[PDB]
Each structure stands twice: as structure tokens, then as C-alpha cells.
Design a protein around this ligand. Structure first.
Ligand SMILES: Nc1ncnc2c1ncn2[C@@H]1O[C@H](COP(=O)(O)OP(=O)(O)OP(=O)(O)O)[C@@H](O)[C@H]1O
Ligand SMILES: Nc1ncnc2c1ncn2[C@@H]1O[C@H](COP(=O)(O)OP(=O)(O)OP(=O)(O)O)[C@@H](O)[C@H]1O
Ligand SMILES: Nc1ncnc2c1ncn2[C@@H]1O[C@H](COP(=O)(O)OP(=O)(O)O)[C@@H](O)[C@H]1O
Ligand SMILES: [Mg+2]
Ligand SMILES: [Mg+2]
Ligand SMILES: [Mg+2]
Lengths: 405, 239, 395, 234, 191
């Protein structure tokens, strides 16, 4: 006896996912409504016209058993009902594989011809015949509940126009997460790959998450958001396992933007639920180091990290190649503070006796979050007095609530 | 005696404590100094001017001697030590040489004192940069700058503080022989320089001028307000 | 616009023809994993469903009276049961050994086919199937580093005849160490691209597992599956995750991970011969590795990826500015001089930012000033976050 | 950190000394050539702003009338070394009524290197090495002599030594241009050609420093007019 | 807690019932509430009452691993709770700090970050109950995260009488009990 030898190269599935299948018609150029496009469009139609006539003739004289609806009916008979869901443990041969049912019992079954063999990978969910357990299909895995957590289904309503004073910051962040997708030709004609990673750092409330929200609003790519504290898991290896899975979802939904907000919270906060102490966090970081810039080839994934404590990060984490750009978010100055007040008081109706210049110097170290918190509390004070117009007294009591006490 | 090496070489060859001291300089008020033909102008931005703060006490422009005055940027408490140590040396030099100190000498002493704190046991580097202006015995206006490292260079015009890069870029374009033809134009140059980083206006500008054979003259807010009107007036005709 | 009416007429017909073609051919489902009908051999599948019975996976435990003509095999059918069975008549008695997985039928449980050893699906995914797009030409300033790397991990497999004739046993291990960004993983990606043997990429953080002894299990199955190949390469990126030095802090600090490292040490150089596996580990914290792992016979060659010298930095600049739209007289030697102790990662960013300034100014060609500003932004402005100063002490 | 200043690497390297050597590579390039007709010292000023006075950047210093020094690395650190060289000289003259040999001056300055430490040290003792490299050049009984000092306290006579950011490139250029029997005017020119090729900026009479110590003649810094005369060629 | 009832209504009741009041005011609808005070002062009592009166589903997040099978088989993030919170909007997510770092506070940050601008469905409010406000993280104390902090001081003489008047109804009381005197007999007592 000799072991079976596969004809397929390797044990992994085909990388391409969700293609046009056989509807991949040739790309006709130019898109302009001209005769050449018409000639090319007719050219595609001509072959299809041949294709329609040729296929019809064969099926016309094909046996009654061998028909498109008959063979599909025979497939269901071969598959049977119910259709058991198992796990692919090993691909022994092209038409043979080792599968395990839900009870943990492994079987050496035969992969039938109609099975999509390029979706076969070890660990995948396979469909087996109830009686003979032969591989008869592959279950398109449902979106994991872990996938739904990262994905921001609806883009946030915050635009770049809602950000004031971060003109350079928007310009730097756009050039690594927005410009490479909207106008990729600029980078190709220059011969440069776009800046790989970006980190937004500064004092709290300076607009780090807000710019990421503006990025998520005007992005055509999948946006995955994970707070750094969410990488601290209750079990060993789960933290590294989660970082590995987060960028695996990013690979599937390419192009994608991964926002690791509050990245510093993974190490600056110690939780007793984390069985491994700082040592497990280090292994979680080492997984993060590989994902940003490691052995595996990275697709169209742009990584945005945000932190108010950038000195506490591992310097190897934000090294060039992993995080190319380090955009600083300083506390607003007088010109920016006025713009932030106008942004958050635009939909407000103000009293004639309120002035934003006096509200500018509420505190020297005034952040945008404090500016916004003053406004919403000022409106809440007006709501308490059953009023729609916010007075200066409402803002005065607003400052003593958020800035003090 | 605390005998420990605070400032040591990084593997790349950098003295990180010196760099961190230069980082504290970048968090201070913007100090601007311009060396004119017969006047030296020192301009310092004021941080968060408080109506309850006695403006006389918090003064970033101080006179080491009758002919030398300096403006600093960085840690206020660190500077006051340097000014006092520099002031004592000005009187020691005058006692021995019987000649008022030169700007080069006192910028050399301060730089040497600053450098000594980057190579001495138990001492952290001074976290200030100094903008020393003044006049020599022969009436030549001199402007010198020191950093925590201990390097002093002479400048026609320079800026230190948070917005040093912006003001210095502004100064490299507007410092010309025509711009320092008169004392009034030279004083306007510093205000024009400080308006680039000061957002509110002349209320956050402290101005000190020194003329040849004269003592340091702090400019009153009304005098400064008079100048800012002229720059605002000259802006209209250039449009 | 004159053909707009006719273009839509033929475009709709093509779409109608395409849908009509899919009606006869069949392009649907794809959610139960159904292959396109062009590959459907229904006649054969019906024959397989009867002629080829399904086989249950069992492990042989003991052979009773192997010398006689009635050899009886005890099998462990996973979670089902244990059976004393006899061998099938279509396989040889010498083909079944104790401790080997077998395939047994559902009626009399007689062994029908031997099976490959069980390997964790995660371990199976560790072998590289698509090689990287990086060659040795993309690594600059590592000339001596690469030759040492190649003559241990590439030359013995390419030309094994040159070592057997001279009675030479080439080293079976290389440790790449250096500060971050120095090209440790870049060289390993070049090795995998060029290699013809099986390449397995193992990240140390992947070996950290929730349960006790699981991490050491994956190391055992990793070397078990590497031994199923004539020649193999295992890459241990960031081995400091599991390769840390052993210690006793009273409590069981890092006891589980140390066992994984102890298993890796055992497979590299233990009682059993390792095989034709040539391991390769990269770490930016080699001072943290256990002395047993850092010993010849496990990591025979210690290749240091120090920060490039002036010639090396100029070479890395040439590599990354090769495809750029640079100007005439870019003084790359001058740029290499402006960053004395800088990793190749910073040099690549300098090249990227240099062209990034040109894109900023709507310019199609990157000037020398753009590189000078890029050096200031990367080497100088970003020196606060530089990992180099802290990591040269570690390397 | 945990390491002290006087800590040995596993390879026998004083960690702080090796680190201080890396500080020179960030300093400005300096070229020194020793010829039978005198010693040549050139250094680039490295102006970073047009508002900076080039004359204030003093990277060549009069140690004495017969010996001068070119410095590269941390300029602030070499002031301490220069001061003693200007004190050790004029102490030899006080005690022996003669000018101290260039080698002895470099020897005295070299002893200051490695006189650093954390514990068991005088209150005035330094805490870190001098992150500067000096190129002493002068005329003595042995004729023109050029000596190179490094933060390790290691001084050596050099016929033509280049220190600074472009030490590697300029030394290679120096080897291709230096022959033992050449005039000092050739040394001034040859050093300026090498500097102009390694400088970031365009070479002119304001961003460089030239000094010469000829036999008989004293230490002489080149003025703007003198520099323009040799710049006009190449 | 008459003052506290009014405060929590303006932040959890009004945004759910009358979103137009906040849109007319031009302010963002509040999403985070922190009730702080000594234990037993009515923080959980008031949080449940508002959810009961506003028809908002009340979810208590104790971080218990016994309830993780209901939250989701993954259990890798506490934001997996948002799937079941969105399905029952309007919802009130309530976490109480019993009092390493605090896991309730960590959950608060993760929920507040998603609720900042990354949550599509509205009417998901989040309440935190804590013993003290000075132990709080700087991240939660930062302006803009918790839109209202409501204090629950220990009941005074009059408030103790009301709490006494409330729980004594469930007993067969002889007529003429001087509940005022018993309230005076309990200085510094919680509800
Ligand atoms: N520059 C700005 N312009 C407009 N709004 C701003 C600005 N900075 C802050 N804000 C407001 O402050 C609110 C809170 O700030 P944000 O969530 O962006 O903080 P952050 O910078 O990510 O900081 P951190 O996470 O450290 O607290 C934002 O929702 C936004 O409305
Ligand atoms: N010698 C080199 N020649 C050319 N490019 C290089 C060189 N070294 C590094 N790079 C570039 O810098 C990047 C740094 O990534 P790399 O995988 O090489 O880092 P590393 O040394 O493994 O770092 P870490 O220790 O953080 O894992 C590479 O992807 C490559 O683009
Ligand atoms: N102010 C109060 N009025 C009425 N009952 C109260 C009051 N405070 C506490 N209680 C009673 O105490 C019990 C527990 O209080 P609880 O709300 O859990 O305290 P905390 O506010 O610390 O969470 C509740 O069942 C409630 O009946
Ligand atoms: Mg944030
Ligand atoms: Mg690596
Ligand atoms: Mg309670």
C-alpha cells in the first residue's frame, strides 16, 4: 500500500473570495459611448450568441437523465436530507478527507464531485451526508458575532467639517487612510507605498476619536473599531488569539481600516481577570507586532491607533513600518477654541447676551470635549427651565459643572 | 551627597536628559529677540493673562546688568537660578576687569554653567533657553541664544519657545536691512513676529527695548497697543 | 452620445444572454459550497457512494500475536468504543504499526487503510503556501548576514552533495537578532520566497494556549508534521514570546510557557534526532532567551542585524528609492549620513514621506529637498518614539 | 537605567565610551591634513538658519600660538577639553619656559576622557564621557604634527584624518589625495574639495573654517577674503 | 430622591420620549449616567424605576460568567451585549460597582466608546452606579463621557421618614406609630 498523493498544491483554500464567478466578462475600454466600445460590446455579444446556440444543441440531444434541472435534482438525491454539519480535519487526497461530526467522532469520507473543492480548508465547516458522511458541501460560515462587534455598520454622522483647528491633522490622516483609496494613482506615479500605519496621540478630549469618526464617515473601506482595553482577555492566549482574529476579519473585508482606539489602555490598566499579568499583555503585544508588520503578507488594511499616553506604548509597536505617521493632537488655541464653540453652538439658539469670547477663557487647558460638555450641559440647564434659548447664566452654571466640582 | 549620573549617553549617542530639557523649552512662552542697528528688542508672549496676576512678578525679561538683558523660555524656576547666577558673575567680572561685561562673555558663562549641569553628578540639565541681548563697550548690538545643551550662537533675530519654528520662519523672510532701518520698525518686527503665534493680540505681548547707552525699558501696554494699530494700519494699504 | 442608444441595447442583450446562459449552465447556490456544474461527475459520485464505504478513524493500540498467522489489532475508535479487530485482506500486515491511526469500517471494524498522524488544524495552517514577494535583492546592508543565513538554511538543501562528500554536518539553526526594523523578518520572508522545501512560519504568540500543556503539544505536532517532509524550514518569529529564560518567582510565574520552550528545546536537540529540519528564529530581545535555547545544536548560528552602516544605509536608500520618481542628483550618500543610527524601516519611511511631500505639492518628481524634509520628519521629529535607543541595550 | 557609567560590555567595550563615539557621527565634518609645510584644519559650520551669525560658530580654537584644535560632535563638551588645553599650555610655559609639544597637549586632554564615574568620585568629577572628537594640529620640535582624540582617551598621530558625520567618506577621499611630499596650499585646496563634496549646503567662505599652523608662522584662522581666494578655484 | 428623580428623567426619560426637545435645543442626546453615593441609597432603585416607567429594557451587567451563555458564545467583548441591547431598544445598561483595576469601570469605557458615535441605533442609555466619584478613572471623569453625575446622599431626617413610611406599609402596623421619632433614632442610616 502507498499513501494517496494530492494533485492540489497545498492544504489551504483559494485566496480569492466573493468574485464575479463566470460573469467575469472582459473589461471593455474605453467607457466612452463610441463605436469601438460598440464594436467590443458586439464582440462579446457575438460569442455569447454562439455560446447560447452551442449549449442549447448539446442539451437538446442530451439524455433525459442528464439535464440541468435533472442533474440538480440528482445532486439533492446524492446529498440527501438531513445534511449534517461537520468539521474538516485533514484533506487526505483530492477526493478524500478526514471529517469530524459534532459528537467528536472522526470519519474518513469521500469528497463528492459537486463539492466546491477550493473552499475546503482544515477547520472549515463541511456538510456531510447523513448516512455515508461523505463530503457533499461546504457551509458558508455565518458572520461571527465577533465580526459584528468590530464592524461599524453605519458610518458616524461626524464629518471633517465638524472638526475645527485640526487642519494639519486631517491632512496627514487623510493621506494614509483616505487619499490612497480615492486617488491611488498619486502613489503609483510616484512609486511609493502609502504610509503604512498612523497613530493619533495627544491630551484627552483633543479630537483623536473624532477624526477617526470623520474617517469612518467618508471611507469606502470596512471600518473595524476595537478599544485597546478589549484586548485584555480573561484566558491565556485569548488576547493574542483575538488580535489575530481582528486582522483576519480585516483581511476578509479588504480594503479595511482598523481603529485600535485607546491602545495604551492595554498596559496602563491592570485587571485581575487577566490571568497572565504583564506577561500575557506582552504576548498580546507581540501578536500585534506581527499583524502590523510581520511575516504574513498584509492586504489593503490601514491601521489607525489612538492614545493619550504614547510614552507608555512599546516603542517597537509604533516603529516605522508598523506606524509610519505619529500625528499629534494639541490642546486647542484661541482660534481653534472659538471654532469648536461655533461647531457645537451652531444648531443651538443663543441669547443676545451670550458671548463666545468670554467662554474661550473658561480654563487655560481647555479641550474640545470640555467645550462640547459646556454646551450640552448649558442646553440641559435651559431644558430644566423649560427654555429653548440658552442664556449666558446657563453657560456660567455650565462651566461650574463640567470644569469644576 | 547625591552622586549619580543623571545625564548619560544613549546607545545612539544622544544625551536624552538634554533633549528632554529642550522639550521643556518647547512648552514655554515664545520669546522673540531682534538685533537692530542701534536697538535690541526682546518680545515675550504671555501665557493666559490673568486679571488677578501681578504682572510685575512674572516677568520673562530680566536685566543681568545695565547693558545686558535676557529673555528665557522653559521652566520659570530653572531660569531664575540662571539669572541670579549670571547676575552675580556680571558683578564679579566688573569687579576684576573694571569693564562692563560683554554679551559674548555672559552668554558663554551661562552656556558653560548649563553644560556643566549636563555632565555633573546628581544635577539635571537646566530646562531653559536664553535669548541674551545687549550692547558691548563699542556700541555694537549683540544677540545670543543658549539652549540646555550649552551651545551659544549669535543671531540677527531668533525665537525660542513653543512657536519658535513659526516665528523663526517668519523672521528669516522679514529680517532685512530695511526692516531695521529705524527703531520703530525694529520694534514692529518683533510684534509682527509675535503676532504669528499670539492669537489674541497685543494684550499677550511683553516688550522690552534696550538702546545704546541706555538701560532696559519695558514697554507699557498703551505703547504696545499704539504699535499694533500701526501694523494693523499698514496691513490695509498693502492689500 | 450617438451610440448611447445602441450600446444600452446590446448591453442589455448581453446581460439577458448572460442570465440565459446561467439558466442552462447553472451559476447559483454557492452557499452550500456547490461547485460549478462543469466539474460534476454525477455518474462517478453514485458509484463512489456504493463502491466506497465510509471509514471511521481509529487508532491502533496493540497487536496481539503478531508472529502467528492470526494477528489481532486493538483499536480505539475516538469517542465511540474500543474493539479487538483483525486486519483486512486488501492491506499488508506490515503496513499497520502500534500507535498509528487507521481507517475501519462500520460493520466489523476491520482496519481498511492506514492514516496520516493527526495534526492540529492551526499547526497545519502554519506552513507557508504562497511565498512572499520579497527577494534578497530587497535587503540592503546585510551582505554578510545573508551569506551566513543562506549557507545554513538555503545551501544545504539546494546542493546537499557539497557537504556529504566532505563529511560536513551543516548547522541546523539560525537566530536573527537586532533592534526593530533591522530586517529580521524581511530576511526570513526572502528565505521563504527562495526556498524550495516546506516553510512553516510560527509566531511565538501563536504558541501561547489557554490550557495546560497545550502549547507544548503544538510544538510536538509542529515538529511531527515537519518530519513528514524530506527537508523543512521552521521560522520562529518573535521567539521571545515563549523563549524566555526559566525562573522561580515563588508562584508559578511563566511555568506553562517555559514548558512550551522546554518542548521546543527537546525537539531541536534531545534524545531523538531532529531530522532534516533547519529552524530559524527572529527576536528583538535576545537577552531574554533561555541559555538552553541559545545553545549550538538548537541555535547554532547567531546572526546579528545591527543598524546599517553608511554603505548599508545608502544601499537601503537605493532599494526603496528604486521605483520612485526621484530627481537627477539625489545625494543618497548624504541622506544616509543624516541618519547615523537608523533602521532600514526608517529609511523606507523617509523614502515614502519624501514622495509624500511631492504628492502634497502636486509634484510628480521628488526633489532632494523633499528627502531632507522627510529625514527631519522621520529621523528627527519622530526620534521621541524611536525604538532603537532602548533596543540596542537588549541586542 | 540599571547600568552604571563604568560598565563593561560582554565584548569588553565601555558602554558609555562606545555611545560617546556614536555622538561624533552626528557632528559636523572636520578634515585635518599634516604636511611638511604645516598642518591644515577645516570644518563645516553647518548653518541651520540665515539669521544665525556664522562667525559665532567657533569650531576651530586657538589652543596656543603654535597649536589649534578642530572639534566635532558635541561642541558644548569640547569647551571643557579646550579650556584645559589652554591651561595645560601656559602651565608648561610657566614651569619650563617652553611651548608644550602637540603630542603632550593631546596627551593631557586625553587623560580627562575616562575621568568620569558615578560613585567614589570628587564633587567636580564628570558623569559621562566627552561626546566630542578633537583634531589637534600644531608645530613643535618634530615639525608639523596632527593628532586625533576620541571620547575613549585614545590619541594618535595622523597624517590626514577626517572626523565628523562624513568621516568615512572624507577619509577615503583623503587617502586618494594625500601624499607625504605635498605643499600646504595643496592641503588647503584638497581639504576644501573633500568638504564641498560632503557638505549638505553649497560651499562658500561663510559656512567653513580654515586654520593653519605653519612652521615659524603662528596659528592663523582664514578670513573671508582668504577663504574666497581658495574657494574661487574649487 | 425627588431631586434625583427629576435629574435622571431629563437625561433618560426625555431623550427617549421627546427627542425633539434636544434637537430643538441643538444639543446631543445624553447617553451616560453615573449615580454615586453610599451603598443602599437608592441608586439601583432609581435606575430600575426609570427603566420601568420609560418602558426601557433594563439590563444589569455584572460581568458574570454564569450569564455569558445568554450574552453570546463568543464572550470576547462586552460589546457583544449590544446585539441584545439593540433588539430591545429603548434599553438601559446598568452596572453597579461593588468596590487591580475595576472591571465595571472598564466595561463603562467600552460601552461609552461605542455609544459615542459608533452606534447606529439610538435610545440605548448606559448607567453606572459607584460608591465614590474620586476613585473613578480620569477617562470616565473626562467631560463629555458621562453627561450627568447624580449624587445619592444618605437620607436625612425627613428622607428617612419617607423611606420608613414606604417600607412600613408592607407590615401590619398598629395605629399611632411615631415613625418620625424612629427616623430621628437613625442618624446617618441608608435606605
Ligand atoms: N478639534 C475639535 N473640533 C471639534 N470638536 C472637537 C474637537 N476636539 C474635540 N471635539 C469634541 O470633543 C468630543 C470628545 O472628544 P473625542 O472623543 O474626540 O476625544 P479624543 O481626542 O479621542 O480623546 P480621549 O479618547 O483621550 O478622551 C468629540 O465628540 C467632539 O465633538
Ligand atoms: N536591510 C533592509 N533593507 C531593506 N529594507 C529593509 C531592511 N531592513 C528593514 N527594511 C524595511 O523595514 C521594514 C521593517 O520590517 P521587518 O520585518 O524587516 O522588521 P524586523 O527587524 O523584523 O522588526 P521587529 O523586531 O519589530 O519584528 C521591512 O518590511 C522593510 O521594508
Ligand atoms: N431612598 C430609598 N427609598 C426607598 N427604598 C430604598 C431607598 N434606598 C434603598 N431602598 C431599599 O433598599 C433596597 C436596596 O437598595 P439599592 O438600590 O440596592 O441600594 P444602592 O442604591 O446602593 O444600589 C431596595 O430594595 C430598596 O427597597
Ligand atoms: Mg477616544
Ligand atoms: Mg519581525
Ligand atoms: Mg448595592
Amino acid at each position: 500500500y502507498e499513501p494517496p498523493v494530492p494533485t492540489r498544491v497545498g492544504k489551504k483554500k483559494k485566496k480569492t473570495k466573493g468574485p464575479d464567478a463566470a460573469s467575469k466578462l472582459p473589461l471593455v475600454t474605453p467607457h466612452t459611448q463610441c463605436r469601438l466600445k460598440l464594436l467590443k460590446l458586439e464582440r462579446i455579444k457575438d460569442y455569447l450568441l454562439m455560446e447560447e446556440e452551442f449549449i442549447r444543441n448539446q442539451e437538446q440531444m442530451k439524455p433525459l437523465e442528464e439535464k440541468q434541472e435533472e442533474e440538480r435534482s440528482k445532486v439533492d438525491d446524492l446529498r440527501g436530507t438531513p445534511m449534517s454539519v461537520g468539521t474538516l480535519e485533514e484533506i487526505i487526497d483530492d477526493n478524500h478527507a478526514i471529517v469530524s461530526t459534532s459528537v467528536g467522532s472522526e470519519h474518513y469520507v469521500s469528497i463528492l464531485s459537486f463539492v466546491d473543492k477550493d473552499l475546503l480548508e482544515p477547520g472549515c465547516s463541511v456538510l456531510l451526508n447523513h448516512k455515508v458522511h461523505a463530503v457533499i458541501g461546504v457551509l458558508m460560515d455565518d458572520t461571527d458575532p465577533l465580526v459584528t462587534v468590530m464592524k461599524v455598520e453605519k458610518a458616524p454622522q461626524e464629518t471633517y467639517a465638524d472638526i475645527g483647528g485640526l487642519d494639519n491633522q486631517i491632512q496627514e490622516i487623510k493621506e494614509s487612510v483616505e487619499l490612497p483609496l480615492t486617488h491611488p494613482e498619486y502613489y503609483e506615479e510616484m512609486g511609493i507605498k502609502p504610509p503604512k500605519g498612523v497613530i493619533l496621540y495627544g491630551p484627552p478630549g483633543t479630537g483623536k476619536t473624532l477624526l477617526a469618526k470623520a474617517v469612518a464617515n467618508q471611507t469606502s473601506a470596512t471600518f473595524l473599531r476595537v478599544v485597546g482595553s478589549e484586548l485584555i482577555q480573561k484566558y491565556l492566549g485569548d488576547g493574542p488569539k483575538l488580535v489575530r482574529e481582528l486582522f483576519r476579519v480585516a483581511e476578509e473585508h479588504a480594503p479595511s481600516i482598523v481603529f485600535i482606539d485607546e491602545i495604551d489602555a492595554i498596559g496602563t490598566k491592570r485587571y485581575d481577570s487577566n490571568s497572565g499579568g504583564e506577561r500575557e499583555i506582552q504576548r498580546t503585544m507581540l501578536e500585534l507586532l506581527n499583524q502590523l508588520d510581520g511575516f504574513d503578507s498584509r492586504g489593503d488594511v490601514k491601521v489607525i491607533m489612538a492614545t493619550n499616553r504614547i510614552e507608555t506604548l512599546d516603542p517597537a509597536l509604533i516603529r516605522p513600518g508598523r506606524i509610519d505617521r505619529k500625528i499629534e493632537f494639541p490642546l486647542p488655541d484661541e482660534k481653534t477654541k472659538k471654532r469648536i464653540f461655533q461647531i457645537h453652538t451652531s444648531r443651538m439658539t443663543l441669547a443676545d447676551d451670550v458671548t463666545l469670547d468670554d467662554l474661550i477663557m473658561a480654563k487655560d487647558d481647555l479641550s474640545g470635549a470640555d467645550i462640547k460638555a459646556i454646551c450640552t450641559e448649558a442646553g440641559l440647564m435651559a431644558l430644566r427651565e423649560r427654555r429653548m434659548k440658552v442664556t449666558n447664566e446657563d453657560f456660567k452654571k455650565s462651566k461650574e459643572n463640567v470644569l469644576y466640582k | 551627597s547625591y552622586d549619580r549620573a543623571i545625564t548619560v549617553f544613549s546607545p545612539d549617542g544622544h544625551l536624552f536628559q538634554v533633549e528632554y530639557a529642550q522639550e521643556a523649552v518647547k512648552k514655554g512662552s515664545t520669546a522673540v529677540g531682534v538685533r537692530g542697528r542701534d536697538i535690541v528688542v526682546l518680545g515675550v508672549e504671555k501665557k493666559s493673562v490673568a486679571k488677578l496676576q501681578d504682572e510685575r512678578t512674572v516677568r520673562k525679561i530680566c536685566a543681568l546688568d545695565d547693558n545686558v538683558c535676557m529673555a528665557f523660555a522653559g521652566l520659570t524656576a530653572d531660569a531664575r537660578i540662571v539669572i541670579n547666577r549670571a547676575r552675580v558673575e556680571c558683578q564679579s567680572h566688573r569687579l576684576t576687569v573694571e569693564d562692563p561685561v560683554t554679551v559674548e562673555y555672559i552668554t558663554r558663562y551661562i552656556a558653560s554653567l548649563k553644560q556643566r549641569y549636563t555632565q555633573s553628578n546628581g544635577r539635571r540639565p537646566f530646562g531653559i533657553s536664553a535669548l541674551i541681548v545687549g550692547f558691548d563697550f563699542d556700541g555694537t548690538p549683540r544677540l545670543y541664544q543658549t539652549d540646555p545643551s550649552g551651545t551659544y550662537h549669535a543671531w540677527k533675530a531668533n525665537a525660542i519657545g513653543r512657536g519658535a519654528k513659526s516665528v523663526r520662519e517668519f523672521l528669516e523672510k522679514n529680517y532685512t536691512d530695511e526692516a531695521i532701518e529705524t527703531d520703530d520698525l525694529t520694534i514692529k518686527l518683533v510684534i509682527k513676529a509675535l503676532l504669528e503665534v499670539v492669537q489674541s493680540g497685543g494684550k499677550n505681548i511683553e516688550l522690552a527695548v534696550m538702546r545704546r547707552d541706555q538701560s532696559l525699558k519695558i514697554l507699557n501696554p498703551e505703547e504696545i497697543e499704539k504699535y499694533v494699530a500701526e501694523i494693523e494700519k499698514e496691513k490695509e494699504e498693502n492689500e | 452620445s450617438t451610440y448611447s442608444r445602441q450600446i444600452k441595447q446590446v448591453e442589455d442583450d448581453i446581460q439577458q444572454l448572460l442570465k440565459k446562459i446561467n439558466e442552462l449552465t447553472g451559476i447559483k447556490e454557492s452557499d452550500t459550497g456547490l461547485a460549478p456544474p462543469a466539474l460534476w461527475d454525477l455518474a462517478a459520485d453514485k458509484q463512489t457512494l456504493q463502491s466506497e464505504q465510509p471509514l471511521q478513524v481509529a487508532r491502533c493500540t496493540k497487536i496481539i500475536n503478531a508472529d502467528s498467522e492470526d494477528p489481532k489489532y486493538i483499536i480505539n475508535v475516538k469517542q465511540f468504543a474500543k474493539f479487538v479487530v483483525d486486519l483486512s485482506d486488501q492491506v499488508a500486515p506490515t503496513d499497520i504499526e502500534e500507535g498509528m491511526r487507521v481507517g475501519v469500517d462500520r460493520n466489523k471494524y476491520q482496519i481498511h487503510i492506514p492514516l496520516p498522524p493527526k495534526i492540529d488544524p492551526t499547526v497545519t495552517m502554519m506552513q507557508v503556501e504562497e511565498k512572499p514577494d520579497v527577494t534578497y535583492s530587497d535587503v540592503g546592508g546585510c551582505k554578510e548576514q545573508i551569506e551566513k543565513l543562506r549557507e545554513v538554511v538555503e545551501t544545504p538543501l539546494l546542493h546537499p552533495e557539497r557537504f556529504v562528500n566532505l563529511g560536513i554536518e551543516p548547522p541546523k539553526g539560525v537566530l536573527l537578532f537586532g533592534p526593530p526594523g533591522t530586517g529580521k523578518t524581511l530576511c526570513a520572508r526572502a528565505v521563504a520566497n527562495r526556498t524550495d522545501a516546506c516553510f512553516i512560519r510560527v509566531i511565538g504568540s501563536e504558541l501561547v494556549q489557554k490550557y495546560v500543556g497545550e502549547g507544548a503539544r503544538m510544538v510536538r505536532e509542529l515538529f511531527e508534521m515537519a518530519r513528514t517532509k524530506k527537508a523543512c524550514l521552521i521560522f520562529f518569529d518573535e521567539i521571545d514570546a515563549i523563549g524566555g529564560a526559566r525562573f522561580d518567582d515563588g508562584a508559578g510565574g511563566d511555568n506553562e510557557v517555559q514548558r512550551t520552550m522546554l518542548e521546543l528545546i527537546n525537539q531541536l536537540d534531545g534524545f531523538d534526532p531532529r531530522g532534516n529540519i533547519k529552524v530559524l528564529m527572529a527576536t528583538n530581545r535576545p537577552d531574554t532567551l533561555d541559555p538552553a535555547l541559545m545553545r549550538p545544536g538548537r541555535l547554532d548560528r547567531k546572526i546579528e542585524f545591527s543598524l546599517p552602516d553608511l554603505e548599508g544605509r545608502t544601499h537601503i536608500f537605493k532599494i526603496h528609492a528604486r521605483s520612485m520618481s526621484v530627481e537627477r542628483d539625489i545625494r543618497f550618500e548624504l541622506l544616509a549620513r543624516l541618519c547615523p543610527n537608523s533602521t532600514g524601516a526608517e529609511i523606507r519611511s523617509v523614502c515614502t514621506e519624501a514622495g509624500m511631500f511631492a504628492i502634497r505639492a502636486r509634484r510628480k518628481i521628488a526633489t532632494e529637498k523633499d528627502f531632507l524634509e522627510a529625514v527631519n520628519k522621520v529621523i528627527k521629529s519622530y526620534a521621541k518614539f524611536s525604538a532603537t535607543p532602548r533596543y540596542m541595550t537588549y541586542n | 537605567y540599571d547600568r552604571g557609567v563604568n560598565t563593561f560590555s560582554p565584548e569588553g567595550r565601555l558602554f558609555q565610551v562606545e555611545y560617546a563615539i556614536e555622538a561624533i557621527k552626528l557632528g559636523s565634518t572636520a578634515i585635518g591634513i599634516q604636511t611638511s609645510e604645516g598642518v591644515c584644519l577645516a570644518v563645516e559650520k553647518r548653518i541651520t538658519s540665515p539669521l544665525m551669525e556664522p562667525s559665532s560658530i567657533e569650531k576651530i580654537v586657538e589652543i596656543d600660538a603654535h597649536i589649534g584644535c578642530a572639534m566635532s560632535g558635541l561642541i558644548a563638551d569640547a569647551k571643557t577639553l579646550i579650556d584645559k588645553a589652554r591651561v595645560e599650555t601656559q602651565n608648561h610655559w610657566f614651569t619650563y619656559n617652553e611651548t608644550m609639544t602637540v603630542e603632550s597637549v593631546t596627551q593631557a586632554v586625553s587623560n580627562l576622557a575616562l575621568q568620569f564615574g558615578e560613585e567614589d568620585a570628587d564633587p567636580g568629577a564628570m558623569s559621562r564621557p566627552f561626546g566630542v572628537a578633537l583634531l589637534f594640529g600644531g608645530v613643535d620640535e618634530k615639525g608639523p604634527q596632527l593628532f586625533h582624540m576620541d571620547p575613549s582617551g585614545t590619541f594618535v598621530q595622523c597624517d590626514a584624518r577626517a572626523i565628523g558625520s562624513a568621516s568615512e567618506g572624507a577619509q577615503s577621499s583623503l587617502q586618494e589625495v594625500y601624499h607625504k611630499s605635498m605643499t600646504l596650499k595643496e592641503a588647503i585646496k584638497s581639504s576644501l574639495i573633500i568638504l564641498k563634496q560632503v557638505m549638505e549646503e553649497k560651499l562658500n567662505a561663510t559656512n567653513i573654517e580654515l586654520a593653519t599652523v605653519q612652521p615659524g608662522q603662528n596659528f592663523h584662522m582664514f578670513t573671508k577674503e582668504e577663504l574666497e581666494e581658495v574657494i574661487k578655484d574649487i | 430622591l425627588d431631586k434625583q428623580i427629576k435629574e435622571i428623567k431629563e437625561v433618560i426619560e426625555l431623550p427617549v420620549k421627546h427627542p425633539e426637545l434636544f434637537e430643538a435645543l441643538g444639543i446631543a442626546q445624553p447617553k451616560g449616567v453615573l449615580l454615586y453615593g453610599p451603598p443602599g441609597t437608592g441608586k439601583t432603585l432609581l435606575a430600575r424605576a426609570v427603566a420601568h416607567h420609560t418602558d426601557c429594557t433594563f439590563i444589569r451587567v455584572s460581568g458574570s460568567e454564569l450569564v455569558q451563555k445568554f450574552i453570546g458564545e463568543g464572550a470576547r467583548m462586552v460589546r457583544e451585549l449590544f446585539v441584545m441591547a439593540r433588539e430591545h431598544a429603548p434599553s438601559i445598561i446598568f452596572m453597579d460597582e461593588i468596590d487591580g483595576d475595576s472591571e465595571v469601570q472598564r466595561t463603562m469605557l467600552e460601552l461609552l466608546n461605542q455609544l459615542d458615535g459608533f452606534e447606529a441605533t439610538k435610545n440605548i442609555k448606559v448607567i453606572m452606579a459607584t460608591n465614590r466619584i474620586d476613585i473613578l478613572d480620569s477617562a470616565l471623569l473626562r467631560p463629555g463621557r458621562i453627561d450627568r453625575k447624580i449624587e445619592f446622599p444618605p437620607p436625612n431626617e425627613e428622607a428617612r421618614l419617607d423611606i420608613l413610611k414606604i417600607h412600613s406599609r408592607k407590615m401590619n402596623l398598629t395605629r399611632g406609630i411615631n415613625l418620625r421619632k424612629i427616623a430621628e433614632l437613625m442618624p446617618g442610616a441608608s435606605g
